[PDB]
Amino acid sequence: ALFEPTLVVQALKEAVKKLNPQAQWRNPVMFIVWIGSLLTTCISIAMASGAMPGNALFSAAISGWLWITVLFANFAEALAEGRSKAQANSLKGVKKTAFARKLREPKYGAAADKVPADQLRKGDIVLVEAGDIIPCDGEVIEGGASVDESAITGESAPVIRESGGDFASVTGGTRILSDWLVIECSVNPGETFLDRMIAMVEGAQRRKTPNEIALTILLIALTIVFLLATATLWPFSAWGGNAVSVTVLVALLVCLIPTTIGGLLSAIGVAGMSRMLGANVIATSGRAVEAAGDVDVLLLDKTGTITLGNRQASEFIPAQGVDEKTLADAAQLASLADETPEGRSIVILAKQRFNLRERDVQSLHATFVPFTAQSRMSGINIDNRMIRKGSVDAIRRHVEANGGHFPTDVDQKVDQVARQGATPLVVVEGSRVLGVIALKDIVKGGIKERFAQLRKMGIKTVMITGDNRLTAAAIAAEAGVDDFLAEATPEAKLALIRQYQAEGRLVAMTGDGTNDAPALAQADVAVAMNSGTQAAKEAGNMVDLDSNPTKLIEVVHIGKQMLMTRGSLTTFSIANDVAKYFAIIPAAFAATYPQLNALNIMCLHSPDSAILSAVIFNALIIVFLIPLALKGVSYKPLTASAMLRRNLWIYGLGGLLVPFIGIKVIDLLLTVCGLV
Amino acid sequence: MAAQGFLLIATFLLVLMVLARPLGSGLARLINDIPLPGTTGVERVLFRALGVSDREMNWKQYLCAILGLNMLGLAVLFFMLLGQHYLPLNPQQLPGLSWDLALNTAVSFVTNTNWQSYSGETTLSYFSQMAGLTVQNFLSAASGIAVIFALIRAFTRQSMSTLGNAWVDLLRITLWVLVPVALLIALFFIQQGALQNFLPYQAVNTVEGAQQLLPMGPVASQEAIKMLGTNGGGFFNANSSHPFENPTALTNFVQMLAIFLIPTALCFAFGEVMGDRRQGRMLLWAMSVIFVICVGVVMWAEVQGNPHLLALGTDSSINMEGKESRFGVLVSSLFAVVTTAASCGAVIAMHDSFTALGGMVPMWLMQIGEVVFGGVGSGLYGMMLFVLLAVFIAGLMIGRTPEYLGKKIDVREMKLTALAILVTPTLVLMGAALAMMTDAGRSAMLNPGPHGFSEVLYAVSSAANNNGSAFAGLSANSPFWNCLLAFCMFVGRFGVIIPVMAIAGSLVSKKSQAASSGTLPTHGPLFVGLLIGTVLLVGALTFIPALALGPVAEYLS
C-alpha cells in the first residue's frame, strides 16, 4: 500500500500513543528512554516552578525532544503494524456487513435464510449467488462456478470450484463471480483461514525470534554500559568543582544508547512478516523465516507441475486462420482445471489481453480434468470437443493415439519459440491445433543468474523432478540448477535430506505437504504447495498460495534481508556514538574542565546548541531510517566476505561519518534560526 | 629514536614468535590430552598417588574444581598472612599483617591481580613470600590456563558433555610448563644480579658513613613465576624497577618475553588444536596490530615528555621522571604497554610520573578488557568473548545465524557472553564512583587536578581487570580501599571465569558444521580489522567520558 500514505499515517499517529509504561517496559531500551524523558520533564517542571535554579527552557526543549524521540520510535512500529494489518482490514472490509444466505435442505431449490449469521457450525448448508461473498471455509456439495480468489491471492484470477476431485475447496473471504454453489461448512469460526490470517497480522512479536532475542541482549548490554558510564559521570565531574547537570546526563544517555535499532527492531520484524505475507507465503512465526536464511541447500519440487514455475505465459500465437481471441478463450478454458502456476498464468495472460473474467459452467455442462504429473495434461470436455493442453510431445502422443494427425504448419513456430528459449505448450481441441504458446521467464536477470547468485552466497540448489533423465537434464540445464534428482520416491527423498543434513548443511525443501509430509517434517524449512489450509497450517510447513516451487528463493531472500537489516542498523547505531561523544563531551564539560574545548572538532556554537543538536539528530535519524527498515536493505548477492565488506562500507563508515554532518547542519539550522 | 624503537618492537615480536611456536605446540599437546613425551608413567603413578585418577567431568564440576582450589588457596594465604609472625624464616621479626591488608593481599594473589598496596620488603617474611605468594603465583596462573584449556576443549569437542579433568589439567600445567620454564628464567636471573638467598638484612657502611639495610631474600624464584604467569607481584615496593629484580636489559628482555610467552603460545595452541592455524593467526595479528599501535603512541608521548623541562633549564625534554636509567624511555614505554596490556602488574617505570597521553593508552588497554595479549588465558577468553560478539555482528551483517568454528551460537551463549563483557566495566565504574564520593577514597590522592582521578581510575581498573599495575601515588592501604579493591578483584575474576565456563558447557553439546562458501571466514585481513574495530569501539564507547575527565583533561590543561 505505497509508502507512507496519508489515509493510514494519521490513523496510526492516533495509535502512536502507547506511551503508558505498561506497553513500554517490554522494550528495555525505550523504557530507559521513557524513564529519562519523564525524569527530565519532571525536573524541568521543577525548574520552571522554582525548586532548583537553572535554565528551565533548555531542559524543557531536551525533554520535549526526548518525548519526540519516543513518539518517533512508536511511530515506526505503528507504521509497520498498520502496513501489516492493512490487507487484512481490506479483506475484512468486504467480510464485515456481508450478505450471507443459508439454506434449509442440502439440495438446490430449497428455502433460504436471509440472516447473515456468523455462528455457522459443522454441517451447516449455505448457498451463494452471482456477485456474492462466501461466508466461511467449506466444501462444495454440488454445482459449478467461477470464483475470483483475489481476496487471498492479492491478484484477480478466476478459478473453478465444483463437486468431486480436489476442486471442492472454497474459502471465505474471496468473492464468487458467475454462478451458484452450495457449500457444506467444514470448520468452526475461530480456526478459519481469515481468522488465522487476522491472528497472523495481530499476533506480531508474540513469540520473539531468537535473533531478535540475542540482538535485544546486545542492546541491553550496551544500554547497561552506557547507563553506568553516564551515571558514574556525575561523581567523576563533581571533583572538578561543579557537577554536570542531570539534563545533560539524560540527553547524553539517550544519545549514546542504540535508539535507532532499539526503536526499529519491531518495525523490522513486522515489515519482514509483511513482506513474507505479501509474497503469498504464510508462516506461523518469523522463526522459520529466519531459519530460511541459515540454509545451505535448497530442495525444489516440480512433480505435478511443468518446469520450475519461473516460466510463465507472455504471448499468444495463432497457428493459421485462427482468431487470437478464440485461441485465448480455448487456452483459458483448458487452463481453468490447471492449478499449477503456468496454468494460472495462462488465465492471467488471457484476462490481461482480452478480459475474459467470468465464465459459465452449467450451460457448458463441462467436465474438468485436473493436471497430473504422469500425463502432463490439463483438459476439459465441454460437450464433445476433446479440448486438451500440455507439452508438445504429450500432444504428439495424443494425436498418435487419436485419428487426427499433427499438422506441420506449427513446426516453424515451435522451433522459433525454442529459439528464444521459452518452453512451448500446445493446445488441441479434438483433432486440430489452434496455436502454440510460449512461456517467457519472469526473472529479469534470469533464473540461471539467480541460481548462480545463490551459489555465490553459499546455498546449493537441488531440483527434484520425478521424470525421465532425458527431460531432467534439459530442465536442469535450462534452469541453472547445480544438480538434479529424477525418478524420486519419498524414501529416497528422505535419504537425500538425511545425507545433506549429515554433512553440516541445513536443508530447505518445498513440497506438496500431503504427498511430501515426512520429507517436509524432516526438513528444517518446509513450504507446502497445493495443500489444504485447514489441514496444513496446524501441522506447519508454511503455506504457499501460488504453489510456486521458486517461492523458496524469495523466502530465503526476505529472511536474509531481515537479518542484514538488523545487523546493518545495529552497526549504524553503535557507530553513531563516536560523533555523539565528539558533540556532547566538550559541551558537557565546558564549565568543569574548560580546557576540553579542543575536542570540539566540529565548530559548534554553544554547549546547549551542541547537546540539543545531538538530541535532535537522535530523534530525526529514526524517521530517516523508517523507509530503510520497512523496505529492508538493498543487498547485492555476492560472497560472504564481499557482502560483509560492502555492508561495512555502506553502514559502518556511514554511521561513523554522517552523524558529524547531521549534527553540524542541525546546529547550522539552529544558529540561522536564532533558537540558541 | 624512532628507528631504535621500531627495531626494538620488531626484534621483540620476532623473538616472541620464534619462542612461543614450540611452547604453542607443547600447550596444544597438553590441550589434546596426549601427555608430554618423557612424562607419562611418572605422571600415571603421581596421579594414582594423588588419587585424582581418571575423572572426565563436565563444566559444573570443572568450575567447582577451579573455585574450590581458589578458595582453599585464599583461606591458606589469608591465615598465613595473619599468622606470619608465628612462622619461621623471619629474621627481621616482622609482625603479622592486619585483617584488611591480609585480605587484600590474599584476594590479589589468588585472583591473579598481585596488588602491592604495602611495601613487601618491610611487610612480609621469607616464609610468607615463598610459601603463600609464590604458591599462589603458580596456582592462579595454572587456574587461568586450565580455564582457557577448558574453553579450547569446548570449542574442539563434538557433541560431548564433559570437559576434561581439571585437577589433571592443573597438575600437568604446573609441573610441565610453569615449573621448568620459570626455573630456567630464575637461574638466568641469578646469573644476572637478582637474589636467591635467605640471609638476614645486610647492614652497609656507606662511603660517606651512612647506613643501608639491603633487603636480601628469595627474589628470583618469585620473580620468574611473576613474569611467566603474568602476576606482577614484586618482592619490594618497586615492582621491577628495583636492581635486585631487574638488574640488566637482558633480564628485562627475558622478562617481557616471559610475559608474552604464555598468551602467544596459547593462541598458537588454539590454532593447532582446532586444526586451522589461520584461526590462531587471526588473534595474533589483531593483538599484534593493537599492541604495536599502542607501543608507538606511548613511545612518542614519552619521548615528547615533560614540556616544562626545557623551560626549567634542561638539555632534553624526555620524561625521565620515574624511569630507571638502566633502561631507555623507549624501553620503559614498551614495558609499560607490555605488562599493562598483558594483565601483569610489573612496572620498570612509575606510571604515575608518565605523561597524560602516555598514561591514557595504558589504562585504556586495561579498561578494554585486558584482551591484547592479556593474562595467562584470562585475557584469551576475553578476546574469545569479543570474537563471539564480532561473529554475531558479522553474521547478522551478512545474513546468517552466527557461528564460530562451525558451532552455532544461541540465546544462552549470547547471554553469558554479554554478562562476561558487562562484569568488569561495571566494577570499574561503580568502584571509581564509590571511591570518588568518599573522603576515605579521595584522601588517598597525591596529585591534584585530573591526575588524581586518573590515579583512582587506574587503581580501580587494576583491581577489576586483574592487572595490579598501580599509579603508585595513591595510598591504597586504607581499610576502605583494601575492601573495595578486594571486592573488585574477586568479582572481576570469578564473575568472568564462571560465564566463560558456562559458555564452555553450552558449547560442548553442539555439532560443528563443515565450512562452505557461505560460511563466514573468521580469518584474513577483513576479520582481523573487524575484531580490532569492535574491541577498540567497545572500549571507546565504554570509557571515553572517564578518559576525557582524566588523562585528556590533564593533557589539555
Partner: peptide, 29 residues
C-alpha cells in the same frame, strides 16, 4: 551524602536491576 544524590543512586540501581532482569529474561521482553 544528600537527598537528591541518594535518590539518583537508588534510581540508577533500580534501572540497572531492571536491565539485568531484562537480560536474564530476554525471551519475555
Amino acid at each position: 551524602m544528600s537527598a537528591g544524590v541518594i535518590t539518583g543512586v537508588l534510581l540508577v540501581f533500580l534501572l540497572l536491576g531492571y536491565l539485568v532482569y531484562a537480560l536474564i529474561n530476554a525471551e519475555a521482553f
